Amino acid sequence: KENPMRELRIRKLCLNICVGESGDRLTRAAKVLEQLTGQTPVFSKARYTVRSFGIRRNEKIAVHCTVRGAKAEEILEKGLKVREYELRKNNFSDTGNFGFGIQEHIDLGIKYDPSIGIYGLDFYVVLGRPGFSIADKKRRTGCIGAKHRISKEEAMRWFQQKYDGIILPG
RNA sequence: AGUUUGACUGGGGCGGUACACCUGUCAAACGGUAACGCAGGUGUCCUAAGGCGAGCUCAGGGAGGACAGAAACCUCCCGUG
Ligand SMILES: [Mg+2]
Ligand SMILES: [Mg+2]
Ligand SMILES: [Mg+2]
Numbered sequence: 001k002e003n004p005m006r007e008l009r010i011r012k013l014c015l016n017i018c019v020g021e022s023g024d025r026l027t028r029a030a031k032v033l034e035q036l037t038g039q040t041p042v043f044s045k046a047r048y049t050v051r052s053f054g055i056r057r058n059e060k061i062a063v064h065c066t067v068r069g070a071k072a073e074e075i076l077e078k079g080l081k082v083r084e085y086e087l088r089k090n091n092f093s094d095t096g097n098f099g100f101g102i103q104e105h106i107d108l109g110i111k112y113d114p115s116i117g118i119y120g121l122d123f124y125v126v127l128g129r130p131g132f133s134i135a136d137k138k139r140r141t142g143c144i145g146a147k148h149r150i151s152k153e154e155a156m157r158w159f160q161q162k163y164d165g166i167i168l169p170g
Numbered sequence: 171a172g173u174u175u176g177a178c179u180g181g182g183g184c185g186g187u188a189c190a191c192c193u194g195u196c197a198a199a200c201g202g203u204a205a206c207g208c209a210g211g212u213g214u215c216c217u218a219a220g221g222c223g224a225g226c227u228c229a230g231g232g233a234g235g236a237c238a239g240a241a242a243c244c245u246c247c248c249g250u251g
Contacts, residue, residue: 016235016244044243053242062243093234095246101236120236124245138225149247152233 008150008158011128013072015041017121018062021054028116030063035110036121037075041065077163078108079123085163088170089156096150098159099124127155 015037017029026043033041041063049057067075082102092098103120106112127150134142159165 012245014235014245018236018238018243020237020242046242048241050242053238055242064244066244091234093246095233097234097246099235099245103236122235122244124235126245 005130006148008127008129008154010072010076011068011126011132013067013075014064014124014126015067015075015121016062016064016124017119019119020061022060025117026060026063029119031116032105032110032119033063033065033121036105036108037065037067037071039065039067039071076123076125080163080165082107085165086168087159087165088168090170092152092155092159094152096152096155097124097126098155127158 015033017033019026019029030041030043033039042065043060044062044064046055046057046059046061049055055061079100079102083100087098087100091100099122101120101122102108105119105121129144129148129150131148132144134140135144156167160167
């Protein structure tokens with residue numbers, strides 16, 4: 001019934017670890033991300049100096065990476081094992097993307113290391129349909145139109161259908 | 171002993187610099203146009219903040235994401251500046 005060019009898919013996954021400060025803690029955090037993705041992450045600096053947070057401008061604060069394709073689908077399932085396939089209702093944004101967090105990275109499938117710590121991280125699945133890339137192309141870029149967009153209800157339907165997930169009414 | 175001891179200035183002195191310059195207005199839709207008219211600025215700074223080329227998009231806001239809160243990072247959307 002539905003056009004095959006409308007089926008939802010995962011664009012990227014966008015793991016993020018926001019450590020407070022720079023140094024060996026951030027280097028260990030980037031090591032955690034590399035172990036999780038098989039893929040070298042990138043450090044992000046602080047926009048502004050905030051001394052209540054102890055950060056300074058242009059200081060390496062966090063580490064993040066984006067995963068696409070089969071590897072993204074694998075990492076998302078690992079993260080959803082920790083969450084027990086239970087995403088709260090408000091975890092879904094109005095643009096059709098959702099996300100969650102985990103507190104310990106060990107239960108993702110990575111063995112503990114005495115030197116490395118107890119880092120948590122953020123998962124943020126960005127959903128899309130085929131044809132979403134026209135907003136990113138260089139030549140003749142465009143928007144996707146109203147029907148082709150993803151709503152919060154459609155993203156929730158996709159999660160319930162694909163991962164047999166449970167949406168708590170929070 | 172010789173000489174000097176600025177100028178403008180609603181008298182002169184005191185105060186200011188309207189004494190060399192730049193922006194908006196005055197200024198009366200070309201240009202020009204005065205008051206110790208109004209609002210301000212200048213005596214610097216930059217091997218890049220100069221020269222090309224490439225790739226990007228900014229302020230702000232909305233919605234989301236462990237710690238993370240009104241402000242830490244990540245993601246999407248709107249965004250004529
Ligand atoms: Mg005239
Ligand atoms: Mg004129
Ligand atoms: Mg260019």
